């Protein structure tokens, strides 16, 4: 007696992959348990290292066609982290790590700000080049009135620079509400913030309170500013990037490589380690429980799980190594957890179902390349191929980005826009939330607690119940998920 | 993969060394074939229309192909029959001077991957149960290859 | 003991091969270990025969498509 | 040049046509939206909604009060 009697229905985890056979996520499905909550309960709360905590078990990908600054700051908006890839020269990826850590919530990332010393085309030029107009000149560059739209329409040379009397302005620092309000009281569209020395701090634009939404999931550090992560070689050169980007207050590292456990990466977990004992360093990639051992005893603080799964990679058909994903992602997350390590599934993600199943093997996080990429935040502008607007996305390990003897593990193509991250994540976020309800568990760690104890259920699945899983037996059909 | 494998254990006993033939493809099945116990690995296709391979290139749909026959085929028996092989098309893979250099950096490199420094130190690996191995399901290479994209275009070298 | 320890993880060849199912290229994977040397000092010396000895696995196929004079020299020159 | 307007419609509906054209002004507007103070903030999003602008200059019933446009409605989530 005590805890109930359930009828033994499926495998557990562990039997699911005792017959040794090359699982993924396709393979198997979890069986259902008892809803006893609602979908919107699902605590997301995920552990991306031993020290930092997101509200969202989603990662955006260090890619070059994925993460920088806007998606960045788009993934830490919704809950989660974004990590800047490194396909860029130091200052590069450490200018976009401080563009993110200086978002602001409302406020002007780099306004374009000119001086008294210039021309009413300047203007003009910055008009034809960023897209506004409305510009907050001062003494030397980054207070005297601003140069707006409404001021320059009715000339045809170029030498309006509006006085002091825009009196509405903020004395130090102010909250959005408090910006709210002045926006109303006041009907102009530029509300520029000072200090007590009265210089140019921050900037309001009007068009950004007009649709500035909340974001609940913060993923905020203590000073309350976005979390942002780093992609660093294990290279010499990389020591370097590493200083230029904790200079810029990066809250996290990942050692972005193809095989992660060799003495180069562990040599590089050390040098962290003993260099800036505050950061936190994720180990990668890792798919078998030795390489996690390595890089666990090194010193890592988190781990990040994939070879050969990911969507542009060939690694698999060319270095002949890997590990099916489903499979990589239990054993190292099994053997992880021995040590409060979490760890990171790493690719193949391409439905909302992998994210549940990736979750539900152990990993704490699922990071996403491919089902984030071709979004608005994502780096690279649309093209057009047999009319649908198409991003690029290629692999680190391709040609065309080593081009920035060799043996591409990967792959360059194209993907189909998805929208923006805005209004992607949160179909994900629910997606997860009511698959977790599905489940039967209340939250993420409630359901890595379900399957580590046997009473979560797998099922596996011929090619045939794979078939039968999708969509079949019609003549043609459109599938919109969200 | 079994023939190589369980050829290769039996004749290593003797120290006979074996010559995995046929079926290579890529650069990861020639890891794979000397992983297994192979010493040598013999390529027919992977090396046929090269600048270096017999015949002269012909034109068909706007590729450079070579031709491509098998001993045993009949247009290579002429030279009541059971053709035991095919003839057909390779498109043009350059040089074998710029085309095995690729596959002696890929082999090197998966070998890197392995953690072997080499050939003999991988099959000493295998064969004392410290190099480990993993099955594929079909939907697990399916997932190893190229997946969930518009299009897409494959630079090997 | 003086050997280290690793965790067990996947098969060994001759676990792989235990199921007796038909396995070929396609259907395996090899494992990562641990890189402590770089790609290039990976010595590709093999044994063609009892006594012959090549410095690249690599041979080409006896077929009529494949190997005459020009590509038998090629490949002896690569190895 | 000139146009000459179609009749495949009622006389009323050329009549009003030709109106419009003997009244265009050269810059100013042709049959501008008008509202009333005995009108909620509601009809000057159904205004934005129909035709494309949110700036009318409203008064007694047609065609001198203020005007309302769009500076002064988007901070609200009700209609008054
Ligand atoms: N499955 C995967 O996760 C995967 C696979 C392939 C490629 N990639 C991406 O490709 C990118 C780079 O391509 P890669 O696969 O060659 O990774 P990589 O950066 O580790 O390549 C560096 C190569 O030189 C060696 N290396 C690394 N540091 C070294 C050092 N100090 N000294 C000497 N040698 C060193 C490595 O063995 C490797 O062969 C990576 O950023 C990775 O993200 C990922
Ligand atoms: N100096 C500026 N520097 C940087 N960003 C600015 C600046 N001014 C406006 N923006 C940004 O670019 C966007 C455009 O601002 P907005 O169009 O609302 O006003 P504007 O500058 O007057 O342009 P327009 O005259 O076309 O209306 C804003 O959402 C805001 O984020
Ligand atoms: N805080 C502000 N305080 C005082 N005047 C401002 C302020 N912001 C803009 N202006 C002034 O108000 C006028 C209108 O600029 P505003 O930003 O409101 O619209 P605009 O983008 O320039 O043009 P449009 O109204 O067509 O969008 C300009 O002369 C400008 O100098
Ligand atoms: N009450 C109105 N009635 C008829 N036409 C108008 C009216 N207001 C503006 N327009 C016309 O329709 C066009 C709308 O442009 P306009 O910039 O003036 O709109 P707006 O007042 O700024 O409102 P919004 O902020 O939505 O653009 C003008 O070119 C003008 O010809
Ligand atoms: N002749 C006018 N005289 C006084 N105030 C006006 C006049 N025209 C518009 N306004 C007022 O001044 C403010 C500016 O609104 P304005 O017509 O210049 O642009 P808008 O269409 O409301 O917003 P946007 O700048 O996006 O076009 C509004 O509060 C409006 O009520
Ligand atoms: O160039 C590459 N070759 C092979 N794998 C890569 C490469 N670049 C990135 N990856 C991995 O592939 C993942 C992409 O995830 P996915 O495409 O959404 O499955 C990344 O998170 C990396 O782990
Ligand atoms: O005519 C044939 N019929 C069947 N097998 C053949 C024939 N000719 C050659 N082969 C074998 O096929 C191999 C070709 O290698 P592959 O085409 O690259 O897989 C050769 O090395 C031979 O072992």
Redesign the interface.
């Given at each position: 007696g005590g805890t109930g009697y359930v009828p033994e229905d499926g495998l557990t985890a562990q039997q699911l992959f005792a017959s040794?056979?090359?699982?993924?996520?396709?393979?198997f499905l979890i069986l259902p348990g008892f809803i006893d909550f609602i979908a919107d309960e699902v605590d997301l709360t995920s552990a991306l290292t031993r020290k930092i905590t997101l509200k969202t078990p989603l990662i955006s990908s260090p890619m070059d066609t994925v993460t920088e600054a806007d998606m960045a700051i788009a993934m830490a908006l919704m809950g989660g982290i974004g990590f800047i890839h490194h396909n860029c020269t130091p200052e590069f990826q450490a200018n976009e790590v401080r563009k993110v850590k200086k978002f602001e919530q409302g406020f002007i990332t780099d306004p374009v700000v000119l001086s008294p010393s210039h021309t009413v085309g300047d203007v003009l030029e910055a008009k034809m080049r960023h897209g506004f107009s409305g510009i907050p000149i001062t003494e030397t560059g980054t207070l005297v009135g601003i140069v707006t739209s409404r001021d320059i329409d009715f000339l045809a040379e170029k030498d309006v620079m509006t006085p002091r009397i825009e009196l509405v302005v903020a004395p130090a620092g102010v909250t959005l509400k408090e910006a709210?309000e002045i926006?109303?009281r006041s009907?102009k569209?530029k509300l520029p913030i000072v200090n007590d020395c009265d210089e140019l701090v921050a900037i309001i634009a009007?068009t950004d309170?007009?649709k500035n939404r909340d974001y609940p999931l913060a993923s905020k550090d203590s000073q309350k500013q976005l979390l942002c992560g780093a992609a660093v070689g294990t290279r010499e050169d990389d020591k370097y990037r590493l200083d230029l980007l904790t200079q810029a207050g990066v809250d996290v590292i990942v050692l972005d490589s193809?095989?992660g456990?060799?003495?180069?990466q562990i040599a590089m977990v050390h040098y962290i380690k003993q260099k800036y004992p505050h950061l936190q360093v994720i180990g990668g990639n890792v798919?078998?429980?030795?390489?996690?051992?390595?890089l666990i005893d090194a010193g890592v603080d988190g781990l990040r799980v994939g070879?050969?799964?990911g969507?542009?990679?060939?690694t698999?058909?060319?270095?002949?190594?890997?590990?099916?994903?489903g499979?990589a992602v239990y054993?190292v997350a099994e053997?992880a957890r021995r040590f409060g390590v979490p760890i990171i599934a790493d690719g193949?993600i391409?439905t909302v179902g992998h994210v549940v199943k990736a979750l539900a093997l152990g990993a704490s996080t699922v990071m996403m390349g491919?089902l984030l990429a071709a979004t608005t935040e994502a780096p690279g502008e649309y093209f057009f191929?047999d009319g649908?607007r198409?991003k690029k996305?290629r692999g680190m390990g391709?040609?065309?980005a080593m081009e920035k003897?060799?043996?591409?593990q990967g792959?360059?193509?194209?993907?189909?826009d998805k929208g923006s991250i805005q209004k992607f994540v949160p179909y994900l976020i629910a997606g997860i939330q009511h698959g977790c309800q599905d489940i039967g568990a209340r939250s993420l760690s409630v359901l890595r607690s379900m399957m580590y104890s046997g009473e979560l259920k797998f099922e596996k699945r011929t090619?045939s119940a794979?078939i039968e899983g999708g969509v079949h037996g019609l003549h043609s059909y459109e599938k919109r998920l969200y």
């Open positions: 040794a056979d090359g699982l993924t996520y396709n393979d709210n926006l109303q009907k569209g009007r309170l007009k193809s095989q456990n060799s003495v180069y798919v078998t429980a030795a390489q996690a051992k390595n070879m050969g799964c969507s542009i990679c060939i698999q058909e060319v270095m002949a190594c890997g590990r099916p994903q499979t054993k053997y193949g391409q491919s191929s649908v198409l996305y391709s040609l065309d003897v060799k043996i591409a792959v360059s193509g194209s993907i189909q090619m794979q």
